[PDB]
């Protein structure tokens, strides 16, 4: 292991200076206006980039992150950054909340207060959590990688180490996308140190077998079919990163408008929106998240995740049973999520689902998009555990 | 139709100036050295970019293109650029040679002399061609698009118009990749104005039927299997462009190292190489081709092709019969080609294949990589026609 070194976000003035420079100097491509059908439209990204240049306040954003204790350490040869927010309730339940690609901890800013100091927010002090919010190896404030092989089981092995080093003998593992797989595998590695696992995004695979795609109501079949859209329309980024993540790095690292355009795909389509990204996620919060990728120069290091996680990717396979998991588990189903899980397929592999939530609003970035929902849902799950 | 306006490549000094500027100012991404497995390695692309900065001579390249008469015109609402190189043999056979994505006419510089003035090159004056070498709508020197809907049949409809406007009543349509589909469809549109079609890259689909994947020797099956590699490893760019070509535009348009990294994928892996791109294609010729995309700012306009050509793409389907074609046709099979065609599957749909060549060396950019082969092969095909 290593030690926990206090950390603050401190973007050099010169880096802020270059970013403005590069934005000014953008060579705008000449593209036909087809709305959002082929990527971000010129009108939108151009006035968004002017704002990023001329209105957005990185230092204010930086202070909003730094209100929270952060640390870095070194584990199995990555530096890992994390927020560590202790509740004023000493008996709060510890929970690690792990983002996915293209995630950051700023997804979680709006849930931190209500989860950690429910008492202040007019809530039930018994419902409090202690929070650990790491940035994945190679992502964002964890910084780029200097060696690779960060497969899933290695991330999860590292997370178990982190929680033990922090002193947490009983914790909840929460996440979606890479964070959901990480939490599920911790189920295998730390069954005993686990109060439970909670996933807000869940791919349920058919097994590939006789007795199955038969029992499934028409509604389940349509839920499985949802995946076709991500598959058809939204998986270019994953296919690229799964094969040539260095190439993606060169395509993100030297143009902030490229970095912006690429990530606007997720904020338009993975998030639950109607007319634009800001209907789901505040403009400044989104730009904070995106700027984190730009300043830390982790477009390429973060892309490595799909190359490493190939076997798990929804573009490599949707078929097969997962190992049986017996840790108490909870699912929240968000309607804008790119995959839509069928509980009977989940129950096939998970022996102890004690909580299943179907929310009415919100997409892929569930906590960021609908923090009040997510808070309520996590508190309910936490209650259900405490009775087990 | 419109007129044929004489054209020369004339890149503004200020554009050359910015390119050097941007190369100097590249923010290099921090990536682990894994050779070429995940994209271009740092060592290679960095010294290649220094050369592009400090050694490569665009003006010399520009003069090498401008030794050739060029024109632009306006057809069905695209400006289309083309080389038009008349043979000193007035009775030469006219041939249009059409590139694919990510193609340019500089692929063909080394074949122009021997095809058009065989007499000078110590060859058979009877074997001469007149050449038309267009840049596809939205590609390179044709410039970016200002409206879209450039599906295949529209490109081919435009090509038939161009050849008629140039005065060519009997011509060969040659190409691979988008150029092969274009030539095959001209088979449908201009059967009578066609001497023949020649394709150097050919996807042969199974029909989907009982009587077929059975007659096929083990060797044919392995030829069909080749496709798995492009599919598995090389199709991220196509999947991106097929869904979000504007996003690709933003990722190419504002960083020359991004534009370079992206296209090095094809020059390493689509071309037939061992250790590096320059084993297949001279470094300066390659940089000329890539610089053409950079200066014309057609990374995004060219990407539109896959979005438009979705139904034809090898990532959407490998299955189905094509319409029956009865125009005399010739195939050349290059061993580094990403798809490997089975003649019995080709014969299923093509009623008059009169020439089938299996070459020993060369990949995707067949003429650029092995111009002597390609010349010999085209002359042989031309002979075979003339006897029909």
XYZ file of C-alpha atoms in Angstrom:
776
model
C 0.000 0.000 0.000
C 1.108 3.632 0.310
C -0.032 6.553 2.463
C -2.939 8.939 2.005
C -1.455 12.235 0.753
C -3.760 15.272 1.101
C -4.689 16.695 -2.331
C -6.321 19.799 -3.814
C -7.226 20.683 -7.368
C -4.762 23.387 -8.437
C -4.807 23.998 -12.158
C -1.831 26.140 -13.169
C -2.681 29.613 -14.374
C -0.635 28.884 -17.475
C -2.856 25.887 -18.234
C -5.969 27.962 -17.883
C -4.229 30.465 -20.166
C -3.495 27.908 -22.875
C -7.050 26.567 -22.806
C -8.476 30.034 -23.521
C -5.824 30.436 -26.232
C -6.765 27.173 -27.904
C -10.458 27.928 -27.731
C -9.896 31.306 -29.430
C -7.821 29.682 -32.127
C -10.275 26.831 -32.917
C -10.377 25.992 -36.613
C -14.074 25.344 -36.955
C -15.009 22.566 -39.374
C -17.391 23.188 -42.232
C -20.294 20.799 -41.714
C -23.896 20.680 -42.895
C -26.533 21.584 -40.315
C -28.446 18.334 -39.585
C -29.307 19.146 -35.970
C -27.731 16.695 -33.542
C -28.059 13.674 -35.907
C -24.375 13.473 -36.816
C -22.785 15.105 -33.784
C -23.025 18.437 -31.989
C -24.422 21.175 -34.197
C -22.232 24.158 -35.040
C -24.493 26.749 -33.380
C -24.544 24.930 -30.093
C -20.938 23.950 -29.707
C -19.666 27.315 -30.876
C -21.680 29.359 -28.316
C -20.852 26.743 -25.723
C -17.170 27.179 -26.452
C -17.444 30.979 -26.264
C -18.996 30.537 -22.850
C -16.299 28.090 -21.809
C -13.796 30.754 -22.996
C -15.464 33.856 -21.648
C -18.053 33.142 -18.919
C -17.265 29.841 -17.199
C -15.298 30.306 -13.947
C -12.859 27.437 -13.413
C -11.553 28.834 -10.122
C -15.048 28.861 -8.654
C -15.500 25.299 -9.866
C -12.151 24.384 -8.375
C -13.157 25.798 -4.985
C -16.427 23.863 -5.125
C -14.491 20.601 -5.480
C -11.915 21.587 -2.842
C -14.499 22.116 -0.139
C -14.000 18.330 0.177
C -11.078 16.422 1.633
C -9.156 14.672 -1.110
C -6.204 12.344 -1.116
C -4.006 10.460 -3.462
C -2.220 7.227 -2.803
C -0.393 4.516 -4.749
C -1.884 1.033 -5.098
C -0.694 -1.816 -7.385
C 1.125 0.898 -9.300
C -1.524 3.499 -10.018
C -1.911 6.763 -8.322
C -5.547 6.928 -7.253
C -7.274 10.146 -6.281
C -10.354 10.146 -4.067
C -12.698 12.341 -2.113
C -13.200 11.155 1.450
C -16.131 12.866 3.132
C -16.795 11.801 6.704
C -20.265 12.190 8.143
C -20.816 14.044 11.428
C -22.594 10.790 12.364
C -19.784 8.543 13.534
C -21.975 5.489 12.901
C -22.767 6.383 9.292
C -22.574 3.550 6.778
C -19.444 3.667 4.619
C -20.030 3.650 0.861
C -17.656 3.817 -2.081
C -19.235 5.441 -5.172
C -17.358 4.676 -8.375
C -17.912 6.394 -11.685
C -17.776 4.851 -15.194
C -16.372 6.038 -18.583
C -16.501 9.038 -19.189
C -16.994 9.785 -15.516
C -15.671 12.072 -12.802
C -16.436 12.597 -9.145
C -18.092 15.965 -10.003
C -21.091 13.817 -11.022
C -21.615 13.375 -7.314
C -21.225 16.851 -5.891
C -24.986 17.352 -5.455
C -25.467 14.083 -3.499
C -22.592 14.552 -1.061
C -24.236 16.808 1.485
C -27.531 14.957 1.764
C -25.810 11.562 1.977
C -23.204 12.591 4.575
C -25.139 15.133 6.773
C -28.795 14.160 6.420
C -29.387 15.846 9.778
C -28.669 19.251 8.346
C -30.800 18.673 5.301
C -33.877 18.227 7.477
C -33.486 14.458 7.244
C -32.980 11.325 9.358
C -29.509 11.210 11.019
C -29.753 7.370 11.008
C -29.618 7.500 7.205
C -26.078 8.940 7.017
C -23.173 7.671 4.961
C -19.438 8.120 5.027
C -18.328 8.546 1.370
C -15.276 7.481 -0.579
C -15.394 8.733 -4.167
C -12.361 7.604 -6.185
C -11.350 8.528 -9.673
C -10.594 5.375 -11.691
C -6.951 4.569 -12.552
C -5.993 6.796 -15.522
C -9.072 9.041 -15.228
C -9.174 12.707 -14.405
C -7.623 13.718 -11.115
C -6.001 10.277 -10.744
C -3.846 11.329 -13.649
C -2.677 9.413 -16.679
C -1.235 5.899 -16.486
C 2.408 5.044 -16.744
C 1.753 1.359 -17.143
C -1.262 -0.673 -18.165
C -3.136 -3.944 -17.670
C -5.916 -2.271 -15.619
C -8.478 -4.989 -16.199
C -11.654 -5.038 -14.124
C -10.479 -7.467 -11.497
C -7.455 -5.364 -10.935
C -9.561 -2.217 -10.340
C -11.772 -4.131 -7.929
C -8.723 -5.676 -6.180
C -7.421 -2.109 -5.777
C -10.722 -0.833 -4.384
C -10.779 -3.552 -1.728
C -7.268 -2.513 -0.735
C -8.307 1.154 -0.549
C -11.286 0.515 1.689
C -9.214 -1.671 4.018
C -6.483 0.985 4.178
C -9.115 3.623 5.021
C -10.359 1.497 7.906
C -13.721 0.413 6.501
C -14.640 -3.154 7.646
C -18.257 -2.972 6.438
C -19.077 -0.893 3.353
C -21.486 -0.539 0.433
C -20.092 -0.618 -3.087
C -22.160 1.589 -5.406
C -21.838 2.492 -9.080
C -22.801 2.089 -12.685
C -20.955 1.436 -15.894
C -17.341 0.594 -14.957
C -18.315 1.314 -11.341
C -21.104 -1.279 -11.454
C -18.785 -4.008 -12.709
C -16.244 -2.997 -10.103
C -18.863 -3.197 -7.357
C -20.147 -6.561 -8.613
C -16.644 -8.061 -8.676
C -15.979 -6.738 -5.147
C -18.877 -9.011 -4.371
C -16.521 -11.809 -5.298
C -13.385 -10.412 -3.679
C -14.840 -8.854 -0.421
C -18.051 -10.700 0.284
C -17.426 -10.470 4.045
C -16.366 -6.788 4.259
C -19.559 -5.923 2.270
C -22.847 -4.642 3.659
C -24.171 -4.695 0.096
C -23.798 -3.711 -3.544
C -25.926 -1.126 -5.307
C -25.972 -0.581 -9.080
C -27.901 2.185 -10.868
C -27.136 0.864 -14.376
C -27.402 -2.858 -15.063
C -26.968 -4.910 -18.261
C -28.912 -8.206 -17.905
C -27.643 -10.787 -20.404
C -29.589 -13.751 -21.658
C -27.653 -16.929 -20.794
C -27.634 -18.268 -24.334
C -29.855 -21.321 -23.221
C -33.207 -23.265 -24.077
C -35.262 -22.495 -21.032
C -35.122 -18.721 -21.092
C -36.055 -16.282 -23.921
C -39.522 -17.773 -23.585
C -40.460 -17.079 -20.015
C -39.883 -13.439 -20.865
C -42.956 -11.233 -21.185
C -43.171 -8.871 -24.164
C -42.191 -6.075 -21.798
C -38.940 -7.759 -20.806
C -38.143 -8.420 -24.461
C -38.574 -4.721 -25.243
C -36.379 -3.828 -22.275
C -33.671 -6.054 -23.714
C -34.227 -4.490 -27.137
C -33.542 -0.962 -25.814
C -29.813 -1.751 -26.073
C -30.188 -1.639 -29.876
C -30.014 2.160 -29.883
C -26.748 2.495 -27.907
C -25.491 -0.384 -30.034
C -26.666 1.188 -33.343
C -25.972 4.838 -32.736
C -23.963 5.467 -29.583
C -21.186 2.877 -29.547
C -18.649 4.465 -31.896
C -16.705 5.864 -28.968
C -16.566 2.516 -27.178
C -15.501 0.709 -30.385
C -12.727 3.171 -30.922
C -11.455 3.091 -27.386
C -11.740 -0.718 -27.321
C -9.306 -0.968 -30.226
C -7.237 2.257 -30.538
C -7.375 4.261 -27.305
C -4.024 5.952 -28.065
C -5.487 7.201 -31.338
C -8.396 8.647 -29.345
C -5.791 10.249 -27.051
C -4.172 12.069 -29.962
C -7.655 13.171 -31.045
C -8.568 14.600 -27.636
C -5.316 15.853 -26.218
C -4.476 18.792 -28.538
C -7.891 20.428 -29.133
C -10.322 21.462 -26.404
C -13.226 21.696 -28.904
C -12.573 18.050 -29.851
C -12.619 17.013 -26.178
C -15.856 18.967 -25.805
C -17.541 17.587 -28.938
C -16.696 14.030 -27.991
C -18.161 14.293 -24.512
C -21.234 16.242 -25.615
C -22.325 12.958 -27.173
C -22.829 11.505 -23.709
C -24.376 14.630 -22.222
C -26.927 14.797 -25.066
C -27.749 11.136 -25.517
C -26.666 9.102 -22.510
C -28.095 11.631 -20.074
C -31.845 12.077 -20.317
C -32.478 15.184 -22.335
C -34.995 16.673 -24.640
C -33.694 19.658 -26.469
C -30.102 19.917 -25.119
C -27.502 18.792 -22.530
C -28.370 21.547 -20.002
C -31.940 20.123 -19.541
C -30.316 17.212 -17.710
C -27.147 18.686 -16.187
C -26.283 22.336 -15.359
C -23.997 23.922 -17.964
C -21.267 24.823 -15.444
C -21.214 21.412 -13.797
C -20.934 19.753 -17.217
C -18.076 22.094 -18.177
C -16.358 21.317 -14.877
C -16.481 17.594 -15.665
C -15.234 18.145 -19.239
C -12.528 20.641 -18.167
C -11.292 17.983 -15.722
C -10.523 15.713 -18.701
C -8.905 18.609 -20.567
C -6.669 19.903 -17.798
C -5.557 16.511 -16.487
C -4.859 15.423 -20.096
C -6.567 12.084 -19.461
C -8.520 11.678 -22.675
C -6.130 8.982 -23.800
C -5.420 7.402 -20.401
C -9.179 7.108 -19.726
C -9.814 5.631 -23.176
C -7.566 2.708 -22.188
C -10.379 1.430 -20.055
C -12.329 -0.106 -22.906
C -9.367 -1.743 -24.419
C -8.658 -3.327 -21.036
C -12.306 -4.118 -20.335
C -13.018 -5.562 -23.773
C -14.452 -8.875 -22.524
C -17.078 -7.067 -20.491
C -18.100 -4.560 -23.064
C -21.636 -4.637 -24.360
C -20.168 -4.507 -27.929
C -18.262 -7.789 -27.490
C -21.097 -9.833 -25.974
C -24.602 -9.590 -24.562
C -24.798 -13.309 -23.866
C -23.836 -15.448 -20.872
C -24.400 -16.058 -17.157
C -22.301 -14.107 -14.699
C -20.883 -15.776 -11.593
C -23.470 -16.187 -8.842
C -23.424 -13.351 -6.333
C -24.879 -13.692 -2.883
C -24.042 -10.316 -1.432
C -27.162 -8.321 -0.625
C -27.797 -6.303 -3.656
C -29.910 -3.398 -4.774
C -30.850 -2.187 -8.256
C -32.167 1.193 -9.318
C -33.548 1.413 -12.845
C -33.356 4.815 -14.483
C -35.545 5.271 -17.577
C -32.924 7.028 -19.687
C -30.343 4.363 -18.967
C -28.833 2.892 -22.086
C -29.461 -0.641 -20.882
C -32.716 -1.736 -19.263
C -32.504 -4.732 -16.901
C -34.976 -7.570 -16.512
C -35.267 -8.631 -12.823
C -35.809 -12.314 -13.610
C -32.489 -12.357 -15.522
C -30.834 -10.506 -12.653
C -32.391 -12.982 -10.138
C -30.904 -15.831 -12.168
C -27.426 -14.819 -11.110
C -27.982 -12.696 -7.950
C -29.208 -14.742 -5.041
C -30.002 -11.851 -2.729
C -31.542 -8.846 -4.473
C -33.303 -7.144 -1.604
C -34.091 -3.847 -3.294
C -35.276 -2.999 -6.800
C -36.225 0.518 -7.759
C -37.810 1.831 -10.873
C -37.393 5.589 -11.020
C -39.474 7.854 -13.340
C -36.871 10.332 -14.658
C -33.123 10.418 -15.330
C -30.527 8.709 -17.557
C -26.994 7.386 -17.577
C -25.515 9.952 -15.148
C -28.216 9.125 -12.644
C -26.896 10.929 -9.538
C -25.773 13.973 -11.495
C -29.035 14.211 -13.381
C -31.432 13.463 -10.515
C -29.641 13.777 -7.210
C -32.782 13.877 -5.047
C -33.994 10.582 -6.516
C -30.638 9.003 -6.120
C -30.306 10.119 -2.476
C -33.782 8.819 -1.619
C -33.061 5.563 -3.353
C -29.736 5.009 -1.614
C -31.204 5.798 1.801
C -33.995 3.295 1.240
C -31.491 0.611 0.230
C -29.390 1.394 3.335
C -32.492 0.932 5.488
C -33.305 -2.399 3.932
C -29.741 -3.604 4.592
C -29.800 -2.525 8.240
C -32.718 -4.919 8.819
C -30.901 -7.918 7.323
C -24.230 20.363 -65.536
C -21.669 23.164 -65.203
C -18.405 23.966 -66.985
C -14.915 22.602 -66.425
C -12.967 25.323 -64.572
C -9.162 24.917 -64.658
C -7.762 24.319 -61.143
C -4.400 24.248 -59.357
C -3.484 23.383 -55.801
C -2.528 26.674 -54.134
C -2.300 26.383 -50.381
C -2.082 29.841 -48.812
C 1.218 30.664 -47.177
C -0.719 31.585 -44.057
C -2.205 28.083 -43.947
C 1.194 26.509 -44.248
C 2.245 28.899 -41.476
C -0.546 27.848 -39.128
C 0.137 24.154 -39.699
C 3.768 24.555 -38.598
C 2.521 26.615 -35.642
C 0.073 23.937 -34.563
C 2.627 21.184 -34.935
C 5.079 23.092 -32.708
C 2.398 23.652 -30.118
C 1.153 20.019 -29.974
C 0.173 18.962 -26.468
C 1.486 15.429 -26.543
C -0.614 12.886 -24.656
C 0.895 10.734 -21.950
C 0.386 7.142 -23.065
C 2.030 3.828 -22.227
C 4.374 2.411 -24.858
C 2.641 -0.732 -26.226
C 4.085 -0.522 -29.739
C 1.390 -0.033 -32.363
C -1.225 -2.171 -30.513
C -3.363 0.740 -29.334
C -2.525 3.365 -31.941
C 0.598 5.087 -33.231
C 3.465 4.925 -30.766
C 4.818 8.156 -29.303
C 8.333 7.762 -30.743
C 7.085 7.304 -34.258
C 4.432 9.955 -34.477
C 6.555 12.541 -32.714
C 9.552 12.221 -35.102
C 7.114 12.014 -37.976
C 5.537 15.268 -36.880
C 8.939 16.953 -36.519
C 9.649 15.918 -40.081
C 6.264 17.160 -41.242
C 7.156 20.447 -39.461
C 10.776 20.768 -40.468
C 11.726 18.608 -43.484
C 8.649 17.895 -45.605
C 8.314 20.293 -48.571
C 4.659 21.029 -49.317
C 5.463 23.332 -52.239
C 7.403 20.579 -53.980
C 4.489 18.238 -53.357
C 2.117 20.867 -54.676
C 4.130 21.218 -57.890
C 4.142 17.441 -58.320
C 0.332 17.418 -58.293
C 0.078 20.504 -60.524
C 2.086 18.964 -63.329
C -1.378 17.553 -64.163
C -4.381 19.317 -65.633
C -7.096 19.678 -63.029
C -10.599 21.040 -63.120
C -13.535 21.629 -60.904
C -17.157 21.645 -61.884
C -20.576 21.565 -60.216
C -22.816 18.506 -60.520
C -26.055 17.762 -58.592
C -24.833 20.380 -56.144
C -21.314 19.304 -55.274
C -18.183 20.853 -56.490
C -16.086 17.988 -57.828
C -12.369 18.260 -58.451
C -10.601 15.959 -60.895
C -7.357 15.342 -62.692
C -7.809 14.856 -66.422
C -4.701 13.454 -68.073
C -4.966 12.891 -71.808
C -2.732 10.335 -73.463
C -0.585 11.279 -76.469
C -2.374 8.279 -78.029
C -5.634 9.737 -79.278
C -7.174 6.250 -79.297
C -6.313 5.479 -75.676
C -9.046 3.858 -73.607
C -10.735 6.267 -71.195
C -10.770 5.196 -67.546
C -12.095 6.868 -64.421
C -10.161 5.865 -61.267
C -12.050 6.609 -58.067
C -10.581 6.496 -54.596
C -12.268 5.320 -51.359
C -12.263 6.603 -47.724
C -9.685 7.896 -46.689
C -8.481 8.395 -50.237
C -6.974 11.069 -52.456
C -5.821 11.224 -56.046
C -2.168 11.358 -54.838
C -2.553 7.574 -54.411
C -2.345 7.460 -58.175
C 0.545 9.737 -59.023
C 2.939 6.838 -59.699
C 0.559 5.093 -62.155
C -0.306 8.147 -64.242
C 2.682 8.246 -66.552
C 2.813 4.551 -67.385
C -0.951 4.363 -67.956
C -1.187 7.491 -70.138
C 2.165 7.431 -72.089
C 3.177 3.771 -72.199
C 5.207 4.606 -75.305
C 7.627 6.700 -73.324
C 7.965 4.137 -70.592
C 9.347 1.611 -73.065
C 5.907 0.035 -73.365
C 3.152 -0.776 -75.873
C 1.415 2.380 -77.230
C -1.741 0.259 -77.815
C -2.024 -0.130 -74.038
C -2.624 3.583 -73.335
C -5.373 5.126 -71.252
C -6.899 8.550 -70.932
C -7.415 9.163 -67.171
C -10.056 10.949 -65.150
C -9.232 10.936 -61.438
C -11.924 12.663 -59.360
C -11.950 13.465 -55.700
C -15.204 12.240 -54.119
C -17.833 14.822 -53.081
C -16.675 16.305 -49.740
C -13.154 14.836 -49.957
C -9.899 16.697 -50.229
C -9.550 19.017 -53.186
C -13.289 18.745 -53.927
C -13.744 20.675 -50.724
C -16.238 20.268 -47.927
C -19.963 19.779 -48.519
C -22.584 22.428 -48.082
C -25.430 19.974 -48.296
C -25.708 16.234 -47.850
C -27.499 13.079 -48.986
C -24.469 11.843 -50.994
C -25.527 8.215 -51.047
C -23.764 5.788 -53.370
C -26.218 5.975 -56.220
C -25.924 9.689 -56.201
C -22.104 9.545 -56.496
C -22.400 7.064 -59.346
C -25.134 9.161 -61.041
C -22.720 12.110 -60.794
C -19.819 10.133 -62.256
C -21.886 9.128 -65.284
C -22.714 12.793 -65.807
C -19.032 13.758 -65.531
C -17.860 11.230 -68.085
C -20.591 12.260 -70.529
C -19.709 15.939 -70.057
C -16.033 15.129 -70.718
C -16.966 13.440 -73.984
C -16.288 9.818 -73.048
C -18.767 7.429 -74.788
C -16.860 4.248 -73.879
C -14.926 4.122 -70.599
C -13.638 1.804 -67.875
C -14.720 2.429 -64.301
C -11.972 1.414 -61.862
C -11.680 1.589 -58.081
C -11.838 0.027 -54.673
C -13.616 0.799 -51.451
C -16.107 3.608 -52.192
C -14.685 3.674 -55.729
C -15.480 -0.016 -56.244
C -19.107 0.419 -55.218
C -19.324 3.483 -57.417
C -17.918 1.556 -60.375
C -20.241 -1.403 -59.750
C -23.324 0.834 -59.614
C -22.234 2.588 -62.836
C -22.624 -0.903 -64.187
C -26.301 -0.422 -63.492
C -26.577 3.195 -64.609
C -24.222 3.214 -67.710
C -24.093 -0.342 -68.955
C -23.896 0.868 -72.572
C -21.275 3.639 -72.141
C -19.069 1.044 -70.325
C -16.171 -0.919 -71.783
C -15.840 -2.610 -68.394
C -15.502 -2.346 -64.629
C -12.353 -3.141 -62.688
C -12.185 -3.473 -58.893
C -8.986 -4.010 -56.882
C -10.805 -4.540 -53.559
C -13.908 -6.722 -53.461
C -16.156 -7.851 -50.581
C -17.945 -11.099 -51.590
C -21.014 -11.673 -49.407
C -22.656 -14.999 -48.780
C -26.290 -14.797 -49.942
C -27.745 -15.976 -46.653
C -29.119 -19.228 -48.395
C -29.135 -23.187 -48.128
C -27.164 -24.104 -51.188
C -24.016 -22.115 -50.552
C -21.695 -22.121 -47.481
C -21.163 -25.775 -48.331
C -19.785 -25.697 -51.823
C -17.043 -23.519 -50.393
C -13.611 -25.094 -50.010
C -11.736 -24.548 -46.740
C -9.648 -21.965 -48.569
C -12.669 -19.877 -49.521
C -13.954 -20.071 -45.952
C -10.640 -18.716 -44.665
C -10.749 -15.952 -47.268
C -14.162 -14.962 -45.952
C -12.832 -15.170 -42.394
C -10.057 -12.631 -43.112
C -12.665 -9.877 -42.657
C -12.702 -10.711 -38.925
C -9.546 -8.672 -38.335
C -10.765 -5.419 -39.954
C -14.051 -6.096 -38.182
C -12.387 -6.812 -34.787
C -9.574 -4.312 -34.780
C -9.797 -1.811 -37.620
C -13.430 -0.722 -37.806
C -13.575 1.884 -35.039
C -13.127 4.679 -37.548
C -15.905 3.399 -39.800
C -18.269 2.930 -36.820
C -17.634 6.445 -35.686
C -18.052 8.020 -39.073
C -21.154 5.891 -39.731
C -22.864 7.411 -36.700
C -21.196 10.738 -35.733
C -19.138 12.101 -38.630
C -19.476 15.691 -37.343
C -17.937 14.574 -34.057
C -15.041 13.107 -36.052
C -14.812 16.473 -37.850
C -14.335 18.327 -34.572
C -11.701 15.737 -33.638
C -9.721 16.179 -36.860
C -10.197 19.793 -37.792
C -8.315 21.626 -34.996
C -5.217 19.434 -34.456
C -2.855 18.279 -37.198
C -1.379 15.542 -34.948
C -4.909 14.143 -34.504
C -5.458 14.137 -38.281
C -2.098 12.399 -38.632
C -2.680 9.805 -35.896
C -6.071 8.898 -37.289
C -4.799 8.297 -40.801
C -1.653 6.477 -39.686
C -4.032 3.678 -38.735
C -4.719 3.041 -42.407
C -1.129 3.498 -43.536
C 0.079 0.977 -40.928
C -2.666 -1.616 -41.101
C -4.703 -1.253 -44.275
C -1.601 -0.851 -46.418
C 0.682 -3.869 -46.432
C 3.488 -3.165 -44.034
C 5.854 -4.919 -41.755
C 7.581 -2.595 -39.396
C 6.076 0.804 -40.381
C 4.003 2.852 -42.877
C 7.017 3.861 -45.030
C 7.670 0.170 -46.002
C 4.507 0.383 -48.102
C 4.271 4.051 -49.112
C 7.017 6.730 -49.308
C 6.978 9.084 -46.310
C 6.563 12.241 -48.425
C 3.762 10.834 -50.553
C 1.909 9.737 -47.408
C 2.362 13.200 -45.868
C 1.099 14.774 -49.088
C -2.085 12.699 -48.879
C -2.559 13.504 -45.170
C -1.723 17.218 -45.623
C -4.418 17.317 -48.323
C -7.006 16.398 -45.662
C -5.520 18.943 -43.253
C -5.325 21.911 -45.597
C -8.681 21.370 -47.300
C -10.276 20.884 -43.848
C -12.200 17.858 -45.119
C -11.819 15.507 -42.179
C -15.444 16.039 -41.271
C -16.868 16.367 -44.795
C -15.134 13.110 -45.824
C -16.364 11.317 -42.700
C -19.930 11.930 -43.919
C -19.397 9.209 -46.451
C -19.954 6.353 -44.039
C -22.999 7.842 -42.540
C -24.427 8.165 -46.049
C -23.174 4.759 -47.169
C -24.336 2.919 -44.060
C -26.324 0.231 -45.907
C -23.260 -0.809 -47.864
C -20.813 -0.818 -45.042
C -19.176 -4.071 -44.078
C -20.123 -3.287 -40.418
C -23.866 -3.226 -41.177
C -24.029 -6.439 -43.219
C -21.904 -9.101 -44.872
C -24.922 -11.016 -46.130
C -26.988 -10.811 -49.318
C -26.903 -11.041 -53.117
C -26.102 -7.909 -55.067
C -27.990 -7.064 -58.255
C -26.780 -9.067 -61.247
C -24.168 -7.241 -63.291
C -23.418 -8.138 -66.864
C -20.839 -5.526 -67.718
C -17.466 -7.078 -68.480
C -15.676 -7.069 -65.247
C -12.206 -7.595 -63.892
C -10.986 -8.316 -60.361
C -7.514 -7.918 -58.921
C -6.919 -9.515 -55.532
C -4.250 -7.902 -53.393
C -3.003 -10.009 -50.464
C -3.025 -7.210 -47.900
C -6.564 -6.224 -48.787
C -8.861 -6.133 -45.806
C -11.454 -8.247 -47.573
C -10.583 -11.332 -49.610
C -13.050 -12.288 -52.367
C -14.174 -15.754 -53.385
C -14.617 -15.980 -57.202
C -17.552 -18.394 -57.024
C -19.454 -15.865 -54.863
C -18.477 -13.100 -57.272
C -19.579 -15.287 -60.253
C -22.949 -15.738 -58.551
C -23.777 -12.106 -59.146
C -21.409 -11.051 -61.989
C -22.280 -12.682 -65.265
C -19.206 -11.575 -67.178
C -15.998 -11.656 -65.142
C -13.397 -11.884 -67.864
C -10.319 -11.169 -65.773
C -9.287 -12.284 -62.294
C -5.877 -11.487 -60.905
C -4.209 -12.654 -57.776
C -1.224 -10.448 -57.033
C 1.580 -11.446 -54.587
C 2.249 -8.186 -52.696
C 0.344 -5.041 -51.701
C -2.636 -4.007 -49.542
C -5.580 -1.650 -49.419
C -3.939 1.253 -51.302
C -3.047 -1.091 -54.122
C -1.917 1.399 -56.800
C -0.059 3.581 -54.321
C 1.655 0.630 -52.706
C 2.489 -1.361 -55.846
C 2.122 0.819 -58.901
C 4.002 -1.491 -61.285
C 1.683 -4.386 -60.434
C -1.353 -2.246 -60.774
C -0.259 -0.861 -64.168
C 0.486 -4.351 -65.503
C -2.813 -5.615 -64.221
C -4.843 -2.790 -65.733
C -3.125 -3.141 -69.104
C -3.881 -6.855 -69.164
C -7.544 -6.203 -68.356
C -7.687 -3.553 -71.119
C -6.307 -6.112 -73.573
C -8.870 -8.696 -72.608
C -11.670 -6.153 -73.135
C -10.407 -5.121 -76.572
C -10.906 -8.719 -77.749
C -14.528 -8.883 -76.569
